[PDB]
Write a protein that holds these residues in place. Structure first.
Motif, short mmCIF file in Angstrom:
data_model
loop_
_atom_site.label_atom_id
_atom_site.label_comp_id
_atom_site.label_asym_id
_atom_site.label_seq_id
_atom_site.Cartn_x
_atom_site.Cartn_y
_atom_site.Cartn_z
N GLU A 33 0.86 -1.25 0.05
CA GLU A 33 0.00 -0.05 -0.03
C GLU A 33 1.03 1.34 -0.07
N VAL A 34 1.56 1.54 0.95
CA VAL A 34 2.45 2.72 1.42
C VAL A 34 3.34 3.04 0.12
N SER A 35 4.15 2.17 -0.49
CA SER A 35 5.28 2.36 -1.51
C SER A 35 5.58 1.28 -2.38
CB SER A 35 6.63 2.93 -0.80
N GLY A 36 6.50 1.25 -3.29
CA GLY A 36 6.68 0.20 -4.14
C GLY A 36 7.19 0.82 -5.46
N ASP A 37 7.43 2.23 -5.48
CA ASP A 37 8.02 2.88 -6.65
C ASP A 37 7.09 3.09 -7.79
N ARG A 38 5.89 3.40 -7.50
CA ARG A 38 5.03 3.49 -8.55
C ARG A 38 5.45 4.10 -9.70
N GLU A 39 6.17 5.21 -9.57
CA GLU A 39 6.67 5.93 -10.54
C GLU A 39 7.60 5.00 -11.45
N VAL A 40 8.40 4.24 -10.92
CA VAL A 40 9.38 3.37 -11.48
C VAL A 40 8.62 2.37 -12.42
N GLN A 41 7.71 1.84 -11.59
CA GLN A 41 6.81 0.75 -12.61
C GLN A 41 6.19 1.52 -13.51
N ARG A 42 5.65 2.74 -13.48
CA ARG A 42 5.18 3.32 -14.51
C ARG A 42 6.21 3.39 -15.85
N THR A 43 7.31 4.00 -15.39
CA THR A 43 8.35 4.13 -16.41
C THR A 43 8.62 2.72 -17.31
N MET A 44 8.65 1.68 -16.49
CA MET A 44 8.97 0.31 -16.68
C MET A 44 7.73 -0.13 -17.68
N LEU A 45 6.56 0.17 -17.42
CA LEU A 45 5.25 -0.06 -18.20
C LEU A 45 5.45 0.79 -19.42
N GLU A 46 5.93 2.15 -19.32
CA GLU A 46 6.03 3.13 -20.64
C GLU A 46 6.93 2.35 -21.70
N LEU A 47 8.12 1.88 -20.96
CA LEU A 47 9.18 1.26 -21.80
C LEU A 47 8.55 0.09 -22.67
N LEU A 48 7.82 -0.84 -21.91
CA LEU A 48 7.48 -1.97 -22.52
C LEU A 48 6.43 -1.60 -23.49
N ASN A 49 5.38 -0.56 -23.27
CA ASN A 49 4.41 -0.13 -24.41
C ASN A 49 5.23 0.19 -25.48
N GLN A 50 6.46 1.18 -25.44
CA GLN A 50 7.05 1.75 -26.58
C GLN A 50 7.79 0.72 -27.26
#
Lengths: 71, 56, 160, 375
Positions: C126-143
């Motif tokens: 819940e608290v943390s987990g580098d949601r932004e970092v996961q978002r960057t990873m997902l963006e790289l995957l999509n691109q």
């Protein structure tokens, strides 16, 4: 003491603020420099008569003419 | 050779009109350029996005 | 800044003891990059995505520097943790601009070194987990490939 | 004789053409002379009119004044909240325009040229039929469901282990309208601006309400969904707010009828408890790893452009392809050529696939092997 009538009228009347901003990149086929402000606005601008065209670094911090909006 | 004179006169009149048209075009280009370049003296501009192009 | 313009000079022989890896990888990037008709005749999608892993100094920078001076194109140099920002999703924009600049020159290779920075396994908390970092990873995957992907360049990734 | 007139007319024609061309060239430039003499108009959204002529509208900038409109703009046509242009210098109503377009909306609107056909899709024929009944059956005759006694499906999310290729399912489903479809990666919709994160979602539902028959599919739905926020991040607040706004717009005091949304996520366990509720997630259709028959069908689909010899025993490879992922078959088909590219063997032998399958089976040894959990 220097800035009483002349130096102040020289340290103040002569110069301008020339607020500093950030550059993005110039456009070929001409000077075609691009003006961009972090907190004010982006804009198509140009450098001044006292700069060289070899030093047109893209993404460079510089100030533009407070009125002419020219670096 | 009877109708040749009328054709020559018409050709001369057409050439005279063409010279005047060329002069008028040269004179009109200066006025358009004086404003187009005067506006081109406005490099300081704004940079933004494009939203839409309707049919109006 | 991801535009390689210094022409890193490295020789294939200057790579120590990895001739097998050179043969395996160069043919996976160079061949589709220098002889298109060969793949066009047989018929197959050009291999996309090269991921190199191994010991801390088993050699990945050497292979990347050799590949850079090998091909006659523009290589894209991206640092693993380099693509992040305090802004919400700013890394996503930095990666999308990276992919666009790479599309700029169709002949080009983009290397995402230390892919572990963005390749971190997702977690459930819940608290943390580098949601932004996961978002960057997902963006790289999509691109990379999938919805509106492109077959024009090859990316070489290095993970430790 | 009239033969002399033809020779003379050749000069008059050239004289006339030389004047017509010069006049056209001059008029082309002179048009811009009057074109660049106007000024643009600020655009605002009306709040309400106070008097028969007095109205209050907030311009696209901020603090809103009260101004009037032209005496022939059909004042009643100025909707309460309408979008029109103001007398930028004067700040008065001049002309109205349709709602916004959110250029990001266009960017995500006509950016999918995929033309996948159901034949290409494979391994999920029963899943294909279910999804059809999931989305297109509703638009076909919702009166059927009504006579049944239940409302049509609201929104279906696709569950599938990583590398399952569910995205291909949506790309193919795009083959039902090709203009009435919506696909957003659910990760580019995030921004660091003040609140545009919710603006993207708002624009989505708005553009959807604009065109009645259409579906919105949002891959990578597991990103914006999440489980919850424990006060860990400063975006999780905004991120959770965006998630809730999508939740609200789903079935919040309003039903988006004639349109349903299908989302896909690899990790159904990190899904927020709310998104799994019957109001948000209608039904969960899970796409599993290909079966033996599914694997053979996928290989055949990918086995179109292979120059081979009449000894390709896909049955042996299929029996060899155990627990392979959906994209894995395409990878094997590609590596078949790479092996064929080696030795410059123009044809593709049954041994090339036999070696590609072995190489693939050994490459994936570093995987995690955690399919999914639909809780």
């Amino acid at each position: 003491d220097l800035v009483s009538d002349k130096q102040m009228m020289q340290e103040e009347q002569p110069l301008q603020v020339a607020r500093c901003t950030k550059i993005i990149n110039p456009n070929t086929e001409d000077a075609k420099y691009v003006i961009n402000v972090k907190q004010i606005a982006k804009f198509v601008v140009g450098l001044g008569d006292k700069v060289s065209p070899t030093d047109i670094e893209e993404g460079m911090r510089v100030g533009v003419d407070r009125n002419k909006y020219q670096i | 050779a009877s109708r040749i004179l009328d054709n020559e006169i018409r050709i001369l009149k057409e050439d005279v009109q063409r010279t005047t048209l060329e002069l008028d075009s040269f004179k009109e280009k200066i006025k358009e350029n004086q404003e187009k370049i005067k506006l081109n003296k406005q490099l300081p501009y704004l940079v933004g996005n494009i939203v839409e192009i309707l049919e109006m | 800044a991801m535009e390689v313009d210094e022409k890193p000079t490295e020789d294939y022989s200057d790579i120590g003891g990895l001739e097998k890896q050179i043969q395996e990888l160069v043919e996976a990037i160079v061949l589709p990059m220098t002889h298109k008709e060969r793949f066009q005749t047989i018929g197959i999608r050009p291999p996309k995505g090269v991921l190199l892993y191994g010991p801390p100094g088993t050699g990945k920078t050497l292979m990347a520097r050799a590949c850079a001076a090998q091909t006659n194109a523009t290589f894209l140099k991206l640092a693993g943790p380099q693509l992040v920002q305090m802004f919400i999703g700013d890394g996503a924009k930095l990666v999308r601009d990276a992919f666009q600049l790479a599309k700029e020159k169709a002949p080009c290779i983009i290397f995402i070194d230390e892919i572990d920075a963005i390749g971190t396994k997702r977690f459930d908390s819940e608290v943390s987990g580098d949601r932004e970092v996961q978002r960057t990873m997902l963006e790289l995957l999509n691109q990379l490939d999938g919805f509106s992907s492109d077959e024009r360049i090859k990316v070489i990734a290095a993970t430790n | 004789k009239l033969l002399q007139h033809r020779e003379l007319e050749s000069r008059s024609r050239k004289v006339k053409e030389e004047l017509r061309s010069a006049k056209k060239d001059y008029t082309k430039t002179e048009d811009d002379l009057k074109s660049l003499q106007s000024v643009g108009q600020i655009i605002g959204e009306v709040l309400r009119p106070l008097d028969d002529e007095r109205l209050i509208v907030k311009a696209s900038s901020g603090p809103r004044y009260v101004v009037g409109c032209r005496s022939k703009v059909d004042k009643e046509k100025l909707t309460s909240g309408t979008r029109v242009v103001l007398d930028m210098t004067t700040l008065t109503i001049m002309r109205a325009l349709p709602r916004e377009v959110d250029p990001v909306v266009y960017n995500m609107l006509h950016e999918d040229p995929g033309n996948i056909s159901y034949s290409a899709v494979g391994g999920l024929s029963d899943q294909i039929r279910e999804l059809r009944e999931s989305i297109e059956l509703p638009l076909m005759n919702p009166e059927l469901f009504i006579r049944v006694g239940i409302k049509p499906p609201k929104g279906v999310l696709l569950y599938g282990p990583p590398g399952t290729g569910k995205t291909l399912l949506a790309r193919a489903i795009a083959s039902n309208i090709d203009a009435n479809f919506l696909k957003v990666v659910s990760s580019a919709i995030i921004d660091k601006y003040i609140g545009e994160s919710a603006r993207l979602i708002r624009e989505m539902f708005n553009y959807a309400r604009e065109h009645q028959p259409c579906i919105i599919f949002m891959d990578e739905i597991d990103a914006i969904g999440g489980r919850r926020f424990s006060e860990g991040t400063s975006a999780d607040r905004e991120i959770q707010r965006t998630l809730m706004e999508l939740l609200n717009q789903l079935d919040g005091f309003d039903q988006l009828g004639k349109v349903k949304m299908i989302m896909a996520t690899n990790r159904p366990d990190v899904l927020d408890p709310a998104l799994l509720r019957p109001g948000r997630l209608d039904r969960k259709i899970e796409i599993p790893l290909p079966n033996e028959q599914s694997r053979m069908e996928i290989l055949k689909i990918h086995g179109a452009g292979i120059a081979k010899h009449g000894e390709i025993d896909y049955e042996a490879v299929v029996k060899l392809a155990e627990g392979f992922n959906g994209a894995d078959l395409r990878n094997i088909c590609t590596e078949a050529g790479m092996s064929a590219i080696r030795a410059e063997r123009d044809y593709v032998i049954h041994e090339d696939f036999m070696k590609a399958v072995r190489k693939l089976n050994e490459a994936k040894k570093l995987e995690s092997s955690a399919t999914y959990s639909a809780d």
